[PDB]
């Protein structure tokens, strides 16, 4: 405990990178949701719409489908799963932060105090051709989420003792940049996630490019500032082949993150 009043990201003064324990104390899921996912044409909304469009393309237009998808580092959000529930029978959501899991469980039970994902749900329904409306989509997703679990990407077994069948897909959006303090940890985390995947299973990653921090209001958290070349190197070294890789220049507002664009990739676990 050594507060630095924003000079450096919280929990980073000694080591140079936010300790994971900081996500149990100073990460407020409600403030995060209100700041990034309220959904006008704000920088945050444009980023979110591009994530949703790519997730729509990956799970609905491409062939990424199967029995089990594991969402690694879900945070308190479900936007990343709306299209996925159309192609996967079972979805497991995971995060390191207990507060994030509680916010997820509130939404799963449709508790009145849960965050309102309706305008995001409607947008995804629009993308998918308006075959259903918001509430039917929301219920389909809710029925698809079978488990809410603790995850720690720095551990050889990221989900601990919890048994799961080998997954068809591992999805991780806006997680690895924040969870991995260096590239060796990043590569090892991708390797650890591979133990959850069937041979030839799909790895789907979306995250910020060249971002050293991000803000939840005035609370600053560390980010690993990766370029496209380092990301590709880590994924390949972790035992995957990249099927496609996209870079977009759109960035968060300077008051929320110092990223230079976002990347999206789909990979498959090698031999
Ligand atoms: C998925 C999301 O929305 N997270 C919040 C944001 C954001 C954000 C938004 C915009 C830009 C940028 C940026 N410029 O980078 C980051 C991250 C996640 C990480 C997650 N976390 C932390 C340690 C850890 C371990 Cl060891 N293993 C598994 N997960 C872990 C912790 O709980 C939390 O939920």
UniProtKB/TrEMBL annotation:
SUPFAM superfamilies: S-adenosyl-L-methionine-dependent methyltransferases
Residues that coordinate or bind S-adenosyl-L-methionine: 32, 37, 73-74, 79, 95, 100, 152-153
Keywords, comma-separated and alphabetical: Methyltransferase, S-adenosyl-L-methionine, Transferase
One term under GO cellular component: cytosol
Domain of life: Eukaryota
An annotated Gene Ontology molecular function: nicotinamide N-methyltransferase activity
GO terms of biological process kind: methylation; NAD+ catabolic process; nicotinamide metabolic process; positive regulation of gluconeogenesis
Family: Belongs to the class I-like SAM-binding methyltransferase superfamily. NNMT/PNMT/TEMT family.
Protein name as annotated: NNMT protein
Native species: Homo sapiens
Organism lineage string: Eukaryota, Metazoa, Chordata, Craniata, Vertebrata
Protein's gene: NNMT
């Amino acid at each position: 405990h050594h507060h630095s009043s924003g000079l450096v990201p919280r929990g980073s003064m000694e080591s140079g990178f936010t300790s994971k324990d900081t996500y149990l104390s100073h990460f407020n899921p409600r403030d995060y949701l209100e700041k990034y996912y309220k959904f006008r044409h704000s920088a945050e909304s444009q980023i979110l719409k591009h994530l949703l469009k790519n997730l729509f393309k990956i799970f609905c237009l491409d062939g990424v489908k199967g029995d089990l998808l594991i969402d690694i580092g879900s945070g308190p959000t479900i936007y990343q799963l709306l299209s996925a529930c159309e192609s996967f029978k079972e979805i497991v959501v995971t995060d390191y932060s207990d507060q994030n899991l509680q916010e997820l469980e509130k939404w799963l039970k449709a508790a009145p105090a849960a965050f309102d994902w309706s305008p995001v749900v409607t947008y995804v329904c629009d993308l998918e051709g308006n075959r259903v409306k918001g509430p039917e989509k929301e219920e389909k997703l809710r029925q698809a989420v079978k488990q809410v679990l603790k995850c720690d990407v720095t551990q050889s077994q990221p989900l601990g003792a919890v048994p799961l069948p080998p997954a068809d897909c591992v999805l991780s959006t806006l997680c690895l940049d924040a969870a991995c303090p260096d590239l060796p940890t990043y590569c090892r985390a991708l390797r650890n996630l591979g133990s959850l995947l069937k041979p030839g299973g799909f790895l789907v990653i979306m995250d910020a490019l060249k971002s050293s921090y991000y803000m939840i209001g005035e609370q600053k958290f560390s980010s690993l500032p990766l370029g496209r070349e380092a990301v590709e190197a880590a994924v390949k070294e972790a035992g995957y082949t990249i099927e496609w890789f996209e870079v977009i220049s759109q960035s968060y507002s300077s008051t929320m993150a110092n990223n230079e664009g976002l990347f999206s990739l789909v990979a498959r676990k090698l031999s």
